[model samples]
Every structure is written in structure tokens, then in C-alpha cells.
Target chain A: SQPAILIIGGAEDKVHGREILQTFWSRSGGNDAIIGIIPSASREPLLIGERYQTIFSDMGVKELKVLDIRDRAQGDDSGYRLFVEQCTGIFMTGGDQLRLCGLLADTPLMDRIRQRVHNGEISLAGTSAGAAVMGHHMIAGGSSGEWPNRALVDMAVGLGIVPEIVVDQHFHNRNRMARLLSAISTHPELLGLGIDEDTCAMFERDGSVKVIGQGTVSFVDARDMSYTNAALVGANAPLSLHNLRLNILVHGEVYHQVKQRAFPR
Target chain B: SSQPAILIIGGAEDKVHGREILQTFWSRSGGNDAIIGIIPSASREPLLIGERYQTIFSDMGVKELKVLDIRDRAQGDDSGYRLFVEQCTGIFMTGGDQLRLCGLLADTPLMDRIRQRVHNGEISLAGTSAGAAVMGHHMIAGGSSGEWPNRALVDMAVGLGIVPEIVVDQHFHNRNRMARLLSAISTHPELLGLGIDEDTCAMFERDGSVKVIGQGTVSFVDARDMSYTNAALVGANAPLSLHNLRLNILVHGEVYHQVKQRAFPR
Candidate 1:
């Protein structure tokens, strides 16, 4: 069976992180082993690995292995590959999206981990930068979204594990809807996922989605529309959306991509 | 009288109703009684071609050439744009879709004539929104509205190569388009980018140098030595990494060369 994928965007810790572990472990009947990828949390004053070790130990998971891959140069290690191949769940801690992508992007171990998640043996979760990397399209912030032209934003590639979407964390708190909307306008084909701080959007192997966390997740879809008649021509024009859809959901609300259905906000 | 002075209009509802101003500039330049309005902006739309051709010609005191009436010119088959280039010393592009103008002119014989005319000083090719955008090679598509070039989506069809190594975005400050234009140049460091505010124009001389002319400030972004790799991904929508991009401000008649790189960051 395919293992579940968990992405903890930055700002997840203590209760929220423990909650994620509980949900996944319980769903796996407590038989699955956990692998924590603490690359992002490596730079912080308090080590994320120790925190996870304590949290998982409290949850009765004594075999939690922390893969200490910090930078791009150190992403390659034979032990990291072995842990990922046998692990039932992988967690990516939050820090920097660029750093995460730069380090583990094309390495053999990362590739194997991606394959394991796809093959249903191991689940993968990335918080903050981790979640951002899950989406094939990632937004690297440059400037604000007050402009109509995309010259103010920076874009870069993300892991192709999740295609057709760009993910943003701390959605509502940062007033990032405008920037996310701007990104969608430039590339009308891709969807935007603004998972609020502490929110998670879980994707099942059957192509089903679930949003869980203390806050909410805003999904902005700006496909198949025209922006030619906008009032502001060259600079930041007041956003006049013709057919924009924003879906806000909380825990246990399922999102079906094909049917375009979201559990009532 | 010297060939009717060229009058370039800015794009999309210009601040001063630039279409009318271009006509006025042509009539007033050298106080020449003979003024011609060659419409590049309306060349693609038959309706616009008819309305603007008659109105501009009658208002500018010259016989208007409704090239759209001739099917070949309208379809970009007969070098109709070239005919306008050869016949009119002062040509103005009305503001509309920059992509439309490029589709009608790029790689066509008319484009060659327009370049030849502008270089020879026999004719002046002036444009506003869409017209201004076509002056450079890498054209601007909608991106984030900021002062960084990493925010632009590079469009290959929106510009005419009259100005190589430069991409022009109109309605600059009034529209907060500096960031997107900056992003474009930053993403492709080899290309120099310009953001002209309302009522602004950058006139490029034969030597590939440009002189800013107009009421508003003209923003310049130079990325000649910058490093970027957008093609490493699937398509044009992929993320871009650009390093060491720079920007500058130029006022009316302030000369800047096409080969010159930006010296300032903020």
C-alpha cells in the first residue's frame, strides 16, 4: 500500500508536529517506522532532530532516525539512502525553500525517497520549505504584489512530486493572496495552494485530498480567464478577477481535484 | 522641410492622450505644413486601421494610407508595414496589443524596411504601449509588479528588434511596472530592460545608444554579466535564478548606451 505524505510548512512544532505524527502513526497501525529529514531545521539554535526524537519517543516511536543533511554538498550519503529505503514515513522540517531544493533536489537518496513515497512503502512530509518543494511549481518571493506585471516576483523549479500547483505557507497571515494570485495570473495553467500556518493538505494515493491543522488552507484557481481589460494597465492594477475561485477548508474536509469539490469552508 | 519628425505614442490610454499628442507633435515639428500619421498600432485591426487612418490623416493634414484596405498588407503578406516605413518619415504606433504588432511585423519584409528607415534617419518609428514594447528583443509579459527582473515572463513575440538587448515596459511608475521589467532583465542578464513611465520615450540612435525623452523618469535595468538558467526546467513557467542585476534612472535627453551595463543596485 502507498504510505501517506505529510508536508509541514514552516511554523509547525510541538503540538502540531505531534498531532501529525499521531495521525500518521495511528493510520499505519503503529507498525510503520519514521524517518525525519531535518535539513531545514539544522541551522536553528535548537536542533529539530532532538525535538523530533523527544516527540516521537513520547509517541512510542523509538526508531526515529534523523538524517542530518544540511547543505547541497552534504545531501549525498549512503546511510541516508538506506534509512529512506526502509522507512515508512519521512518528515521534512521547515527552514529555507532554496536550501532544501538546492541540497536534496537531484541526489540519489532524495530520488529514492520520492520513489518510495510514490510506490506506497514510505510516506513523505515537508513542512514550510518542505511543503513548498512538494509542489512542482514554487514561488520564491522577491517583492510585493501591488503591480500587474510579474516583474516583481521571482520563480524557481520545485520537486516534481506534485505537479500543476504552486504552494505558499503562512497564507492569510502574510497577506500573500495577492502575490499568489499574481503568480497564477502569469501562469494560468498552474493552481495555487496557500496553506495557512499550521495547516496541512494531505493527498491520498487515490487522488483525494484532506486539509488538517489549526488554521485554514486557501486554494486559488485562476485558470481559463482573460486579464486584458484590467483597469490598471501597466502597473499594479486593482485585481479584477472574472472567474476566480477561493476555497477555504479546515480539518477532515476532503478536496477532490477531478470533481473540483471542497468540503464546505 | 526635413522629413516629418517621428512621433511615438505610449501604450494603452496614455496619460496625455498620446495618440492626439503625436499628431500635434508632427504638425508642430519644424512648423511643417506637411504631416503624415503612419499607424502601426491599428495595422492589425481592420476596424482600428480604418478609423485611425482616416482620423489621423485628416487631423495631421496629410493623405492617410489605409493599408488595411489592401488585403495583402493587412495579412502581413505584402510588406505593407514596409510601405508605410518607406513612405512616411514619421510613423506612430497606437497603443493596443504589443503581441499583435509583433505578429504582424516580426520576420517580415516590412520589419526590415522599418529598421532601414530608422537607421538611415529617413523615417522615425515611434510607439507607445504596444509600440514601445516591440522595440526590444525580449518582450515583457505580465509578472509581479516590483523593481526586480526575476518577476518577468519572457515573451519572444512582443517586440521588434529596432532595439536589441533591451526590453521596454510602458506605463512604468504610474503602473508600478518597474519590478516586472526589472525581473525580466534580471532573469536574462544578457538583455537590458527599460521601464518608461507615462508620457515617456527612449529614443535609440543608430549606434545602439538611447536618450531618454519625456516628462516622467525612465527606469533602466542592465544584466549583461548576470547569470540565469530558466531553460533547465520544463517550460517558460519554470523558476529562474538570476544574480547581480542592477537598475538606474534616466531623465529626458539623458543618454545611455545599449552596451552600457547598470552601475547601481537601488
Candidate 2:
């Protein structure tokens, strides 16, 4: 009966332990779960949509629908709205964050989902690009393999499913530390959540969050930052940042957002 | 007249020969009738730094002046300092490290009094070098000197934020500081970046009018229309990719309107 947001980094395991997927399944009401999958972010929407549908079907779910919304116009279809209205849980498969935002942002379907999530009426999950679009300020695209710099990040408006937090996926797998650091320095007021592949940052209704899966989740807190040359440094030059608080959480660790403390589980 | 300005100078202004830059601040501060307060908290030798500026202003025909030397954060609450700040018509900050200056005076009641006076157009405030660094909401405390933008190019911290939506970068061109300045602007597109060189100064009025002074040029970087930047989602030391920024270089005696980028030059 409680609401939660399961934000997953890309490449979650379906063949192995499936620890993260299992949590999403159980949280979505398990065997009797009514799941709605949105695969519009993928270029091959039909394949990605059916792939998740098949996964859920094989997991003993009889009722499942892939709301294959590819165009912004289709996002307004009442049929899609009906699915969102009745579904106990909604899953957004990852592909391109920019595409997802362009197709779904400000649409009635997303508005409905946002309302339900905010009211604690449904469970929602987004993976990869799905995870990136959760923030109010989305890190659209940026390069890796460099020190944190002003030019290391490309920012755009996001779905804002989660406010006050900017998210990045494929964290350590892609060596995205410098990217997230550069991004957070621009607005230290917001928290930067860098999720590793196969990991999940599950936020519960009571402002508590738990880390699930095999990889680690990194938290970049620059709110109390002492200094940065972000405004004065040259493009491609190394950025100088001081006093940024960073935290790393592995599987089973718990964090309480309002209280601002992490518990080792 | 409500035409007050927040005067900012790059380091090493011509204090001996012409004194054109400092003279501009002095005249705007009310000429000989000025009740001036000098804050030399940024310098390691507070007494000597404060005394030097005191002498420079005295020689410029200033009748009333006092050195508000603050070496520690605790001194920001001194009743004597607050009294002087309250009655001061013009306040000047001397050169040193901005990190030191803010650590000592930021968020204090004395700083609060000064900010309020400037807000109501009652005081003409000015700062140089380390002083100029604290003019924005995001302060560039220190960092590496690089030719291109990267994460380690500059260190950023909280500042006095006396001026909103603006970040001042001193010691431009001479150090080939284009990289860090571009990086800062790309980091926060909302802020209009000002890069002033040595012996150069820019005065910001309430109407968003900017007047450049001194021999060196003032570089303005407006990133509002910038197309894209890889500032986030990338790793450290990776070169940033930014495009389509409007950069305007202004010379001496030029007037520009910052908010309206179209009618910039006068």
C-alpha cells in the first residue's frame, strides 16, 4: 500500500540472481502484479516493449501491457491513460533520456503517473535513461575520461519525477565520476546520484531509501562546497572543487533523505 | 539620486601615477566628503595592507577614513566594526586571498549591514583582486591556470553574493584565463561572467549598465544562448564540449547593458 520509486542504473540482470528485478516484482504485488511497461525510450520500441512483457509473463504474471508510446501524440491516447490508471506498478525501460523527455514530458500520461506517484497510490520504476530523466535538471549527455570540468556536462530539463536530485546511470562502469562532479558543482543545491549498472536506489514514501543489487551507488553532495573555479576555468581544463561531500553505498545499505543519514544494513 | 554602483577592480590598479580606476571609485563614493571604511581582512599582514590603502586614499584627499582590520571570523561582530560600517558612505576591500576574506567576514552582521546599505543606494562599495572575487554568489576561490576547460581548472565556493546573476573573474587575458572563465560560465548559464584584466575595472549600476575603465579590456561571457555543454555526465580531466556562447570584449570608456545583450555597446 506504500508508494516507492525504483530508479535503476542500466543493464539489470534478468538471467542471474535478479535481486533488483525481484524487488521490483514483489513491490509491484508479485504473482498477481498488474504491470505497465513504457518502452518508448528505445529506438526499437516494439522489441524492447515485448522483451519486458515476456520477462514479466514468464515470472507468472497473467495481466501485463506494454504501453508502446513512440510519439508525443500517442502519449495523449485515453487507452494509455486507462492503463496507467489501473496499473499497480509502471516500469520505464531505459534507452535515450532526451527522447523519453521529448515524447513524454508535459504529456497527460506522465502527468497522471506523476500524480499517482506523488499521492502514494502506485509503485513506479525507471531504469537507465529512465533513471537519468528522474531529476528536475537532467544531465542529457556528456563525455567521460577526464577531470571534473564545466564542459564535462550537458544539462537539459527533465521529467522532474524526483526533485532536488540529479541522476546519472552506468556510473563506475563508464567512469562517470568527473561528469557528475562537474554537474553538481554548477548547482550544489541539488544532490547528485550516480548509480552503477545493475544497482537500484529505491525511495520509499517516508523519505527513506535502500540500495539494492550487486553494484555500488555513489552520492555527490556539494551543498557545503568550499570552492570551485567552474566560472573561471577554460574549457577542457581541469576544474578545482573543494570540500565536496561524497558517499558510496553498496547493496543493502539504507539512507533516510529527510534525516540525511545512511545506515549500513 | 539612486544611481549607486558596485565598483570592482582587477588586481594591481595604477595607484601611483594616474590613479584613474581608484579615482573613479572615489568620485562615485562622494569625493572629499566620503566616510570610507577599508577592509583588509584578506591579507596575511592585515595592518600593513590596510595601512597602505589608508595612505593611498588619504593622499587622494579623503577627509575621513578608518581601517576595519579583521583577522578572524569572530571580529565580524565587533560593535566598533558595525558602527563604522553603518556610517560609512564608501567601503573598499584590498587585495589578498578571497577565501580568507569571506571566511573572516561572510554571513556576519557587519557584512549584512554593508549589503543593506548598498541595496538602498546609500553606499558605494568597491573591491580589488581577492576583493573582486567575492562579488558574485558563486566565488572562484582559487585553482589551476589552464588553457582549456576541465574540472580542476578552478575552485568554487560560496561568496558574499552582493551582486546577483553575475560572477567576476579577475586577472584575465594576462594569465590566458579564458578556459576557467568559459568553464564557470558553462557551469551556470544563468550567471553572466565578467573577466577583467589587471589595471581594469567595471562598475555595475542598478539599471544593469556596465561601464569599463582603465587601460585593459573587460571580457563578458554570456552563456544564456549556449547550445550545449558536457559539464555533467562526464568524468574528471575529460575536456568539456560547449558551443555558441556570446563573448564581448569592451575597451576603456565603453558602456554596455548586460541584461539586454542586443544593445550592448554605447
Candidate 3:
């Protein structure tokens, strides 16, 4: 399948524990890691690249390369493809997930990244907008504060590095439960991962997910749910879901994807 | 996790495919020595449908095969009905109205036992046509087939939840159901849509791998990466425009894993 995917919610404490980033770095051989920082998702790619470069340098990474693919044309460039090939780990910065996905949707560079990740040669980690694009289903835009009503969220295609899960970042801070619920209400099969700000859900090659950081991770499971009014009601109407299962996990908790439940600590 | 394997087929599975699907199910469940249970509740003529499967299985040299004539919810609660499911290595659901089949078994002890057996990996389950639709958490009840995309084009109901990530539709190409499946995935891009053509079947393994069987093709439509311009903005009857949708057509001997999102030729 694919390599490990470390998805962090928005507002991660960059200078504090840096636990999530450290985990990603450690997986890439720690100080010997040649990290590739993709800041294309950010509006200010240069600043974002610099920030990550300094942070990674302080963490004693041997080499840090920035691949700022700003457009679709650049994404197809071979020069950037080599940079991606040389790196053992790729870190995507937070910004607009849709922009990042749009620019790299079918580009050669994205294809190489996917190929490397799936071959188990490299690891991929993203935060905020970067995190949202990890899954095949990307949450483009949605409103907060309302209940799970019909048509409450907008979805788009993603890079699909991690295809099974639907990632939602900044969940607790922004009160995105309603929209996340709405997402699961319609698609009951895919696992809904609502990652709270400052928290990280680190998925291993074996499909086990470990949570890290200060906040929690909410898993919305509609697999065993008996009923839903998703197709019955008209657009913009309130959704009705019955027997939907929910699991909330804190740091150090592990979730087994095949088991469909939390593994005992 | 390894025990409960499900084979869901679209309509018209038998005559065209030469009972290869039934043989596959039989082989998975101890072959000729396998004890199979048939649920004909979906069919209005349970007796006839049950006899048809019995005769077919008998010809295949099965050790034992029993048809549970569950006509309604009352029959679903019968202790004898539950016992018939307990002794089987595999359970096969025949074709009819999906709503009728699920409605009769939902929340009943028979359904609960079947779920437990499936979860424990004790028995394999198979369904065809309407039986195929009931494998997912959400089953397509009714829909129209055409090029025009309309809101509420398909009606959905709670299903058996055996294959959680997909919405299965049967008699796909024969009935021209691409539009309905597309509309369904447009509304819920998170779910993968499996449209099985007549005589074709999709076998969902415990490891999240799906393989295509029989003569026709199985169209797997994934709208997760799509951009729906009018999906949510317009009213119910308005035409829909969805772009960037990924579609993979799998023929016989092709395999795809839902979690990995990768398809390969066997």
C-alpha cells in the first residue's frame, strides 16, 4: 500500500513539543533525514519554507530541500521531480488544501511522490490544509456552528495519499463536528477522522493510527449505522442518522483500522 | 476478520455465468462437503426461488443445503430459522426487492445471528441483485437511469452493513443505471459506487480486496476527488455538473482494494 501518513490538525505548536514533526522526522531516520518541505499549499511559500527549514535545521536534520511548486507547469518539471526523489520524507505545510491538490492533481511530481510513498521508500506528513489533502475525499469548504444539515459542506478531490479516511482538521476549535457528521451521514462507509487543533493522527503501514499532542482525535464510524435520511430528504434539509458510532481518543491511543476500534493500551 | 467473506452479484447472475459464482461460494465454504443456507425472503415466491437454489446446489453435490423460508418479520424471529443459519458454512440471499428482504430481517434475531456469524468469520455470505444492494450501510432502493443528473434521483435505505465503504447497484448496464450511481456518489463522495452489470458479481473479501467475477464488467465510480458545480447549489430537479470524477471499469479477473485505492489485473 502507501507509506505512513502523519496528519496534524491546524494550529500545531511548532516550537513546543513539536511532537508530530519530530515523529515524522524520526520515521525518516532522524538527524540523517533528507527532508523535502512542500510549501505550495501556502500563500507565502517562501516564508513557510524558511520557517520549516529553520525548524528542521534546529531539529538536526542533515539536509532540508524546499520544493515550492506554485503552478501546474512547475509540478510537471523534472528538476523538482529529482528533488522529491532524493528526499526520504516530504512535509507539506498548512494553507489551502484545494490549491495544493489542484496544482498537483495529475502532475509528474505528485505521481512520483505517490509512487515513492506506495513503494515504502519515503514517508508523507501534512498539517491543516496539507492534512485535508491526504485522503481521497477532501473537504474544500464548509460552515461551522450549525447542526449536520444537508449540503453543509463542500467536497473536492485530493492527492489521495491516504485514500480510506476523510480528514478534518481544526475540529474542536472550530466546532466542525456538525459538518464532519454531515460528511459521514452521506458516506457511511469511509472513516471520518476529525482531528482537533494541535493533535496528530499518525497512521502506520499496518493501518494502526496513533494519536499524539495536546488535543484529541474523534472517529465518526457509520459502518454499523442502521438508518440515514441522506437520500430521503431534500437539499439543505437537516440530516437524520441513526446508530452512528463515535470514538474519541487522546494522546498515545491507537486505533486499528481493520479491527474498527481502539486497541488496548 | 478473516472469516466473513461476501460475494454480491447484480441481477441475472445464473444462466449467463454458468453457475461459476455458486461454485465459487460453495468452494469457499468447504466445497462439496459445505453446508449452505439460502434465504429467499427477498423473493415474493419464496418456495419457487428456494427450490431453484436447492436444486442447483444439490446438482453441485453439496453435503447439505437448507432454505430458510422467512416470509416476514415474524418468520425472521422463529427459533428454527435462527438454527438453520447457525449450522451453515455459508448463507446465500436470493434476488427480489431489497427493501422487502431487509425489512423482514432488520433488528430480528435471525439478522443478529447472521451478523455475529459473519463478524466471527464463521460463515461466508452471498447475495445477488437486490441481495447485492443490501451489502453496504446504504442501499439504493429506487432510481431512474439516464444522462440527466437530478437531485433525489435515487432512494436509499439502511442496508446490511457487510461492506461498509461501498454502495452496490445491480443490473447496471442492462438497466442503464450509471446516472443513478453517479448521482448517488455526487451526493456522498465519500462512498465508492460499484455498478455491476448483468451476470457480473463483485466479491468483497475480509481484507478489503474486491475481485470481479462472471462475464460483464463492474464499473467502480469514485467521486471523492470530483468538483460538483451544481450538486449543492441548485434545487432538487436541476441538472448536475460533476468534474474530475475517477471511474475504473473492472472486467472478470480484475481486483481492487478499497482501502489502498489500487486496482490490479489477476
Candidate 4:
């Protein structure tokens, strides 16, 4: 099944030129949008949820639900999971993935959401920390630095929602290039998606992934990484990562995931 | 003996602006100390092609350069040429007919000296177009493109064996040779097939890793995990139905480990 997903970097423009937001709105069926907001990541879940609800409402969405899921038990509630069936689009806001994933990782509600999105029944979007948990594994928390080293990051598992990729948000803004490289050094098989501020990586069926908004989306492909000392050395030791492929796509660019190929478009 | 380097370029690399890929060859060849030799044997008008590259490098700040223009296999034995090959810090192979390049160099004492220089860490070799085609153990001498992966798609022959385990095809996408390379890999499932697009270069290092430079992409058709293949029994022009061949395409700055076949995707 082909999925419709939007991976937004933190601080996506909501005021002027909300190109990323508008695409989300349009892809979610515009006026017919039955939007679901998962605001569990934010400590102020209600406040953040209402913010997006208002934005979508202003954008012409009629039916909207803010699932302020703060507890793990609520994830098991049939009422919470069943609401996904009626959703045309579901969006996750940025704050803290640890809190977000903790409350809903592998939950019935999350599974319901993933199922709907995976089958292309619903479009999904996650920003910043929200983007962190979209991969098979998550960067729960990590320190930022240059020159990839084992001591830089602390890793964890996530929904495994996306295939073979790990998402790093607010990439260049916070000097998180080294942070992403550390993640790649540890798990060299996964392609790292590094989203800069105000940018979005939109994924559609047919293996097309396009970039939108002002900033760039950098892809660090270590699947072909020829050498790394992360293993032979030690877990917390410095890394000597070599020959990693990196590509950055700006607005209007697309990557074909099926062939792991990049084109001028 | 810093590190053995083999630069396999996909032909027609940018001689102007950026010139990032070609610049790498210059930098790796010792920069200020680079005494480079140009192997222009592949071209029909060797002097014309040789001087073009000769000027390109000269302007790039390379101090000493010479064209190793061999018109025939007999010239491959010239002592003056062999001496110059041994004296150079780097060697650049130009674009032309690959079969002709091999016919001039293959099995010759000159070819042995170049190979010896490459392995002894005495020379950093760079090849483009037809020059790139001869880097592998099994080479693609010639063949026409086909609609599908079939026996008729490519012509395979023994190569320079610089990169013995891998097979390479250059001017890949620009010429629409993906299926042609697929056909090559289907027939030789035991090898790794690399299809490098024009303007890009695959730098295979002595440490057993490869990297890409330039804007174009490099396709890795890894058929080692192939579950099914009829390359042995298939007839000419017959379509290939090989399964489980992993094709990974990479562009600039990507590095791949040769031995582990590992990918970090987190």
C-alpha cells in the first residue's frame, strides 16, 4: 500500500506563505477534510492541539478532532482508535517525541492511525519531534555536535512507521548535522532524513517524495557507507565514518525511494 | 603508499565550473607534486584528445604532465612510455572506445607496469568513458541496448582487473544503459555492477570502500542475493527473469563499504 505522509521540520510557517500547511490542507481533501490532531508530544497538548485545529478551521476544514492523548491507557480506548476511521488526515505537532511515543508507541490507537495512513486511506503529517518517531527507530534524545561520535546521541525505538529511514528535524538550524551523522554511524543501514527549519518532505504513493517550503531537506545515505569504526572501537568511542553520500533537495525537488534515486526535479 | 585509489568516471565530466570530480583526481594525485600521465590510447585522434585533457590539468595547477598516447599494441612496449608511467604520481585514462583501449594496453608489459604501480600504491588511477569501462575484472567491451535484460544487451570480456570483484559501466543514464547493466549483472550474479552516470565518478579506495562525486547518481545492481537466474540457459534476446536483485542508487558524498554490504538507515 502506498502512503501519503508529510514530514515537517520544526517551525513550519503558519502565518504567511504557509505553503507546507496549504499542501497538507489540500492533500487532506481541502474543504472535505476530516482532520485528526495528535498533540500528545506537546506538554501543553490541549493548547497545541487547538492551535492546529484553529489553523485547519481557518483553512476550511469542517470536521476536526483533537485527540489530546496524555495517558497510555487512553491509547487502548476503542473510542480513540475508532476515530481514525473517519479521518481524512491526521497530524502530529512538534514538542517531545519521548513523551509522544511513550504514551502511544504500539498503542491500538497508533496502530489504527498507521493502518489508515499505510493503506492510503488517510494522509499523515508530523513536525520536528513528531517527525522523530515516524521511522522504524527514533532519536529519543541526543546532544548536537560536529564530527560524528558515539557519545553525541542517545537512541530509542519508535513506531517503525516509515520504511528504512530515520528522521532528524530542525537539522541545520540547530547544527544537528553531526547529531544525524552519529545516528547514521550507529545504524548505517537506514537512510537519514534531515529536515531544515520551515521545510517539509512530502511523500506520496508511487514512491515520490517531494520537498516544499523555504528550507532544504538533506538526505544522508549511509547504506553504502564503506567504512566506520563505531563497532570495532567501542559504543561510546569516537567515530571515523567514511564515504557517506549526502544529497540536499530544495523546494520542488523529488526523490524516488523505490530505486533510491535522485533526479533534477 | 598513502592509499590505492581508482577513480571510475562516467565520461564528459565538467571541465568548466566546479569541476569537482576532476579536481578530486588532481588533489588525490599529490596536488603540487602531481607528475601525471594521460593514457589517451582509447581515442581515434589521440593527440587532439590528449592535449585537451593535458591543457585541462595544466590549468588546474598541475606542474608536470605527459600524454601516454599508444596507437597500437606494439607501442605498449616502448621503454620510454613504461619509464614515464613508473615515474608519475597519477594516471588519467581518457574517453574513447574501451575495446581499443584494452587492445593497446591489455596483456602488454605497459599494462602490467600500470597495474603494478596501482597495487604497489605508486599511482592513483583515474579513467573516464571507455577508460572507465576497463576497470573491472570482467568488462563490457560492447553491445547494444535492449528493451529488457537479455543476453543480447551487452558484450562482456576480461578487463584490466584493477577492481576485480566489481563490474562497471560508464556514461550510464545519459546513454540509457540501465537495462544493459542489469543484463550484465543478471549474467554475473556473483559480481557487483556499478552504473555511473555522466559527470559522476565512483572512487574506489584501498580501504575497501567506494564514494560518488559530481551531480549524477551511481546505481548499484547487487545481484548476490539473487534467488533465481536463467543467465546460463537463456538464449540471445531472451528476457531475463532474475529475482531479489537489490538495486541501490547513490549520488554525491555517499560511501559504501564493500565487504560488509551493510547500510545504516536509522
lDDT of 1 by residue, A113-216 (tens): 77877777767777777788886777776444233245444678777678778887766445455566556766667767777666678778887778776555
Q: What TM-score does each of the candidates earn?
A: 0.48, 0.51, 0.50, 0.52
State each model's CA lDDT, in order: 0.58, 0.78, 0.78, 0.79
Better of 1 and 4 by TM-score: 4
Q: Candidate 3's error at B181, in angstroms?
A: 37
* C-alpha RMSD by candidate, in order: 16.9, 15.5, 18.1, 13.3
Which stretches in model 1 have alpha-carbon errors above 4 Å?
A16-18, A27-31, A143-149, A226-241, B1-266
Complex DockQ per candidate: 0.03, 0.01, 0.01, 0.02
Strongest candidate by TM-score: 4
Interface RMSD values for the candidates, listed in order? 16.6, 15.9, 19.5, 15.9
Q: What's the C-alpha lDDT at position B48 in model 3?
A: 94
lDDT of 2 by residue, A17-113 (tens): 7788778777788887889998978999888888888788877664798898889998899998998898888899989999999999999999999
Between candidates 1 and 3, the one scoring higher on lDDT is: 3
- Candidate 2 — which residues are off by over 4 angstroms? A234-236, B1-266
lDDT tens digits, residues B1-266, model 2?
Answer: 22457888888899899899888777877878778999998899889989888888898887689999888777899999899887788999989999999999899989988988998889998999999999998977876552235556778888898986788888765555555675677588788888787788888887778887876657666768655555674554644444445555565666668666522333
Please tell me which model should have the higher DockQ, number 1 or number 3: 1
